Amino acid sequence: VKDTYTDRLDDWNGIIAGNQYYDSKNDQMAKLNQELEGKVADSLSSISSQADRIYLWEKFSNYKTSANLTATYRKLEEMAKQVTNPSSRYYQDETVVRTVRDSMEWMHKHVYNSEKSIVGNAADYEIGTPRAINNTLSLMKEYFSDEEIKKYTDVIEKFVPDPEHFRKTTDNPFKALGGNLVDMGRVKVIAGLLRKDDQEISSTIRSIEQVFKLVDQGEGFYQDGSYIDHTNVAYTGAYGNVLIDGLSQLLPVIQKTKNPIDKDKMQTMYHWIDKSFAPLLVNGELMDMSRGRSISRANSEGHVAAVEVLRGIHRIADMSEGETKQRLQSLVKTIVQSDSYYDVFKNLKTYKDISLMQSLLSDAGVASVPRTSYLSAFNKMDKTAMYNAEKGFGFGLSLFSSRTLNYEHMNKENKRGWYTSDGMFYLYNGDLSHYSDGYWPTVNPYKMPGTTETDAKRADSDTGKVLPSAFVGTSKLDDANATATMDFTNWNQTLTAHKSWFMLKDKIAFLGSNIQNTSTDTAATTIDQRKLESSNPYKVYVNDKEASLTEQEKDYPETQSVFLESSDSKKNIGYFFFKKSSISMSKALQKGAWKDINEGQSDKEVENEFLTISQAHKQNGDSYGYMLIPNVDRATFNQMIKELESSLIENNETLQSVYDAKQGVWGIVKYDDSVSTISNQFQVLKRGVYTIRKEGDEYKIAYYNPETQESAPDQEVFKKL
Ligand SMILES: CC(=O)N[C@@H]1[C@@H](O[C@@H]2O[C@H](C(=O)O)[C@@H](O[C@@H]3O[C@H](CO)[C@@H](O)[C@H](O[C@@H]4O[C@H](C(=O)O)[C@@H](O[C@@H]5O[C@H](CO)[C@@H](O)[C@H](O[C@@H]6O[C@H](C(=O)O)[C@H](O)[C@H](O)[C@H]6O)[C@H]5NC(C)=O)[C@H](O)[C@H]4O)[C@H]3NC(C)=O)[C@H](O)[C@H]2O)[C@H](O)[C@@H](CO)O[C@H]1O
Numbered sequence: 095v096k097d098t099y100t101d102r103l104d105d106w107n108g109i110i111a112g113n114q115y116y117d118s119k120n121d122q123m124a125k126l127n128q129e130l131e132g133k134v135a136d137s138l139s140s141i142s143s144q145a146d147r148i149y150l151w152e153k154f155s156n157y158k159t160s161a162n163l164t165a166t167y168r169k170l171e172e173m174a175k176q177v178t179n180p181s182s183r184y185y186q187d188e189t190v191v192r193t194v195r196d197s198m199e200w201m202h203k204h205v206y207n208s209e210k211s212i213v214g215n216a217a218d219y220e221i222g223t224p225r226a227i228n229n230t231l232s233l234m235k236e237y238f239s240d241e242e243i244k245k246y247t248d249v250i251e252k253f254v255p256d257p258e259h260f261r262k263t264t265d266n267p268f269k270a271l272g273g274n275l276v277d278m279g280r281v282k283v284i285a286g287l288l289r290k291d292d293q294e295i296s297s298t299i300r301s302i303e304q305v306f307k308l309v310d311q312g313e314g315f316y317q318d319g320s321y322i323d324h325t326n327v328a329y330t331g332a333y334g335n336v337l338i339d340g341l342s343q344l345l346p347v348i349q350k351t352k353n354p355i356d357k358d359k360m361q362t363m364y365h366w367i368d369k370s371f372a373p374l375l376v377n378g379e380l381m382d383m384s385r386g387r388s389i390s391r392a393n394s395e396g397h398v399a400a401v402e403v404l405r406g407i408h409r410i411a412d413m414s415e416g417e418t419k420q421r422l423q424s425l426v427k428t429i430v431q432s433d434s435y436y437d438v439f440k441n442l443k444t445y446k447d448i449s450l451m452q453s454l455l456s457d458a459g460v461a462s463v464p465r466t467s468y469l470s471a472f473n474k475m476d477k478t479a480m481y482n483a484e485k486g487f488g489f490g491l492s493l494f495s496s497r498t499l500n501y502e503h504m505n506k507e508n509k510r511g512w513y514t515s516d517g518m519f520y521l522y523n524g525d526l527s528h529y530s531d532g533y534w535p536t537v538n539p540y541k542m543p544g545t546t547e548t549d550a551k552r553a554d555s556d557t558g559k560v561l562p563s564a565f566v567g568t569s570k571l572d573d574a575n576a577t578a579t580m581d582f583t584n585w586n587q588t589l590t591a592h593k594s595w596f597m598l599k600d601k602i603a604f605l606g607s608n609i610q611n612t613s614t615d616t617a618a619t620t621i622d623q624r625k626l627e628s629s630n631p632y633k634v635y636v637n638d639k640e641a642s643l644t645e646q647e648k649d650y651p652e653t654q655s656v657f658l659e660s661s662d663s664k665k666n667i668g669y670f671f672f673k674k675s676s677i678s679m680s681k682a683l684q685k686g687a688w689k690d691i692n693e694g695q696s697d698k699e700v701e702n703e704f705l706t707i708s709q710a711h712k713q714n715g716d717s718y719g720y721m722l723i724p725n726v727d728r729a730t731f732n733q734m735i736k737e738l739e740s741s742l743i744e745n746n747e748t749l750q751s752v753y754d755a756k757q758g759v760w761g762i763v764k765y766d767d768s769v770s771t772i773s774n775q776f777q778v779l780k781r782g783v784y785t786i787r788k789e790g791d792e793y794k795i796a797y798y799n800p801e802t803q804e805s806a807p808d809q810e811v812f813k814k815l
Contacts, residue, residue: 099287112445113179134176137169160214164222174233208252221277224250228284257301271313273336296353306362319369320474327499328475331384338406373470373479376488376522378433383492387508390692395530397436427462435526471568478568485725488522495566499558506693509554510539517593519544524664532700535688541620546591548615567800571785574599577761588613596752596761601723608747609716621707633659643681651676668723668731672742681705758788780811
């Protein structure tokens with residue numbers, strides 16, 4: 095029965111499958127179509143036939159694991175996509191139509207109905223499964239009656255009745271904010287159109303609209319671009335991704351309902367793109383520090399994840415006009431063209447997404463210009479992202495605080511994230527593949543780069559923790575220069591450190607003071623654990639003389655510098671030690687499996703070579719002190735460590751400071767309210783974090799107090815001397 099609800103569903107079909115756009119002459123469309131053909135063949139040759147059965151598919155048979163419900167209905171959706179494609183071999187196929195129908199019925203009667211209770215994880219009963227049912231029904235709505243469609247969605251109503259609340263039938267329910275609110279959207283608007291229910295669509299839209307509100311606490315977007323999910327976790331790059339991905343599919347539909355969404359409540363979406371997501375995207379890669387436990391999935395490494403966000407943006411762009419459309423088209427086009435490592439099309443899963451990207455890349459009117467330098471201090475999620483366009487590298491700093499969880503190990507994913515927010519750093523360089531090709535299952539999780547740690551063994555059954563201290567944050571001065579610190583205590587209160595970082599345009603200084611250990615376990619700071627390419631060997635230098643690294647750890651006492659020299663300048667990494675420091679280094683094959691870190695993953699052995707730089711801390715009160723100088727040739731590094739000979743102002747228990755004389759910039763971290771005179775030019779007065787620039791005879795000042803999460807009047811923290 096055909097009216098405006100089914101007009102809306104025609105539009106949804108065009109978005110989630112886009113059969114209407116399919117063109118067999120299109121190389122990239124034809125390839126995805128081929129992938130759906132083979133997936134439907136596998137389901138059809140596999141499925142349980144004859145006299146009534148205990149499952150539809152054996153690989154997905156234990157209906158107590160709820161991931162098996164969604165995986166089963168997603169196989170039916172795939173059949174509904176091929177069955178409504180004129181160019182599929184399954185086009186209006188009688189077996190396929192009958193199979194989808196009988197399978198919906200069998201599921202309804204035996205596995206997933208209103209008499210059922212949630213067993214296992216609720217996301218499946220409330221989001222994953224309802225989306226696959228709704229999509230199946232929508233694609234194939236000319237093969238079902240109105241009564242069948244109502245019958246097969248009654249269950250969806252029992253599990254998701256309220257527009258406002260996500261878990262309501264359980265012995266334990268919560269509030270829909272964030273991507274779950276947008277996920278509520280996709281479930282209920284579509285179930286609403288399928289069931290010809292105006293109250294369901296309108297109230298569902300009224301409810302989605304709250305996602306446009308910036309928040310002060312809990313889940314959602316903050317004014318500084320942070321995005322929080324699961325109560326206290328940094329999560330732009332997974333739950334954020336869902337939010338933008340899901341909303342951007344639903345909007346063309348919402349905008350033609352009788353309850354359209356105001357074009358001013360919209361403008362918040364562009365602030366998300368520019369403030370929250372864009373800083374997180376480097377050479378086509380979405381930074382791991384923002385993806386939570388999704389880092390532990392072989393099929394969602396950084397460049398694959400990035401595409402979720404990008405296809406979100408390109409849809410937003412398509413529904414905009416004039417200037418905002420061109421700019422967002424250009425943002426997407428430049429990100430995609432910088433990426434020599436990953437073929438975007440491999441994560442573009444509908445014909446209209448393929449089509450949109452194709453037109454975008456070949457439209458000469460759409461500019462593809464290299465992105466400019468920036469620096470985003472996501473204080474509200476204790477992360478900092480930095481990017482230098484001159485030299486070509488990004489930097490991520492992964493922290494946590496009293497306000498945030500260090501790592502998320504949930505649904506048996508990310509078993510060894512332990513130290514991923516312990517002042518872990520990321521370097522984004524000419525090696526696009528670095529954090530990919532099985533970085534995550536192969537990296538030694540005891541030696542996460544930048545982190546100071548004991549060598550105690552860790553247990554995979556462990557969960558995340560908040561930090562005892564609130565004194566964790568970034569003071570940003572400008573697009574090139576900031577300072578961070580972290581009042582560090584380890585997971586069992588045996589070790590501390592005052593860790594601070596000095597972001598100074600084309601280099602970052604790492605200071606640690608007040609290093610203390612009450613355990614018997616040895617303590618060390620990992621300077622680096624860099625994954626290598628057989629195709630691009632580093633020549634390694636210590637104090638400017640060639641060294642040769644071995645599987646076996648070698649000691650390099652009296653070290654002023656280490657330099658890692660590629661044939662490509664954009665892969666080079668220098669480490670300048672302000673004071674001669676006692677270090678060790680090795681280069682070794684490291685093995686493991688994705689399953690080691692995500693139970694639901696493959697157990698196949700993966701391997702990669704890694705080069706590890708560590709500094710032992712054997713005494714209480716110990717210190718570290720070095721400058722990371724990326725993307726310069728050896729001769730340039732040698733000159734810069736001469737410019738910087740005296741850059742270290744202080745590195746003690748109450749005060750840390752570095753000075754860039756070339757820029758005239760100071761970073762400073764104070765742990766107490768004493769008067770600190772700095773370079774004989776000014777004094778700084780309060781506990782907190784400082785980035786300062788001398789312009790002739792004035793000072794620009796960036797003070798941040800991380801505990802109260804406030805800046806301050808200039809006269810309370812700064813005085814010229
Ligand atoms: C333990 C406990 O009690 N915890 C609670 C806590 O509950 C937890 O909540 C979270 C949460 O969601 O917040 C739960 O998180 C999810 O867990 C599962 C299981 O491990 C993960 O698999 C899931 O990760 C997502 O999984 C999806 C999936 O496969 O189901 C992924 O799906 C795909 O997403 C695409 C993005 O739009 C989508 O396009 C795609 O569909 C296809 O799209 C096409 C298209 O391009 O249009 C196409 O045409 C197609 O037709 C269409 O099918 C969709 N499906 C496929 C097959 O590709 C998704 O990308 C992936 O991210 C994970 N969710 C996230 C966001 O990570 C957790 O399990 C719960 O336990 C409570 O929340 C908390 C209170 O707040 O308290 C805790 O105690």
